[PDB]
Symmetry: C2
């Protein structure tokens, strides 16, 4: 599995909550680490930060090591565009991605997509195409609406009842590691 | 006929040429006037300004005056995102655009699409779906190759010969003025 994470580095995320989020990630990777499992990370906002590709991960497969030194981005939320860059670059061959592997993406967001040229209709379709399974962790009150949930149910793969985890705050991501973990194993064993 | 212009406001366009362009825009709007025409203008760079909508022109049908105040945005070149808004905002009912009307669009620019999140693949299909006939004018040494001109043809309606124009300076713009003027008459009579 070519397992990749899309992390929201919005300045709407107080230093510690971002501190937390980041501890979340190190854990699930240590936790899902088979032998042939690859990892990749990029931080997104209004700016897009590729912290590492599957291609490197294998010449230093230490989640604590690569995840520790990230620097937040503060800008706004371009989820869609980030999605496009996930498929387009991350899951590209030269970036280590292996062709006969399961393509997986776990998206962690703090709010609705704000001021992005692209839409989901623009990026989603090309994601299915290459067959990227999407799981989404949505964090915070912003996602308490009867329309916020909608965008959450959207980035996911179907069914959404199974790809959406709606948490209350950064502390609380610890609460789903087991889930998120066990779901990503069932599809390899 | 609902007719709209999209004039490149990027930074490689020196002040007096931005003035030459601006001059062109007005004269063509005059020369293409009939009691049933409407004109819309948007300049783009990295930002995007709606100078006048269709229903606002019908408030001050004075090309010349409406254009006088237009100042340069100086961004970089995001033409596809631009095509998007012309299509999503100008040829929009609420922006006074007419239902049973022809929708012509003239693109004017001295540059290759740069650092734009959208592809023409993301836009051309919408333009088509909405019956937007695209004219393209490529000013400068930017479209000096059997390559960047390929961008002109991608934007423009088929067959390409008829919808594309390229001239060396902003100062020659006057040489394709009558050739343009007529084409756009052949759409109606």
């Amino acid at each position: 599995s070519d397992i990749a994470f899309l992390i929201d580095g919005s300045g709407s995320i107080i230093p510690h909550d971002f501190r937390r989020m980041k501890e979340f990630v190190s854990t699930v990777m240590e936790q899902l680490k088979k032998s042939k499992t690859l990892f990749s990370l990029m931080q997104y906002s209004e700016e897009f930060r590729i912290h590492f590709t599957f291609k490197e991960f294998q010449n230093n497969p230490n989640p604590r090591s690569l995840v520790k030194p990230i620097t937040q981005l503060l800008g706004r939320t371009h989820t869609a565009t980030g999605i496009r860059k996930v498929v387009r670059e991350l899951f590209n061959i030269t970036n280590g991605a292996r062709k006969n592997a399961f393509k997986i993406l776990v998206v962690i967001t703090d709010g609705e997509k704000f001021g992005d040229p692209l839409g989901y209709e623009d990026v989603i379709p090309e994601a299915d195409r290459e067959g990227v399974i999407r799981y989404v962790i949505g964090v915070g009150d912003a996602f308490r609406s009867e329309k916020s949930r909608q965008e959450l149910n959207t980035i996911a793969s179907k069914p959404p009842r199974d790809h959406v985890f709606q948490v209350n705050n950064f502390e609380a991501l610890k609460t789903i590691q087991n889930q998120l973990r066990e779901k990503i194993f069932a599809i390899e064993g």
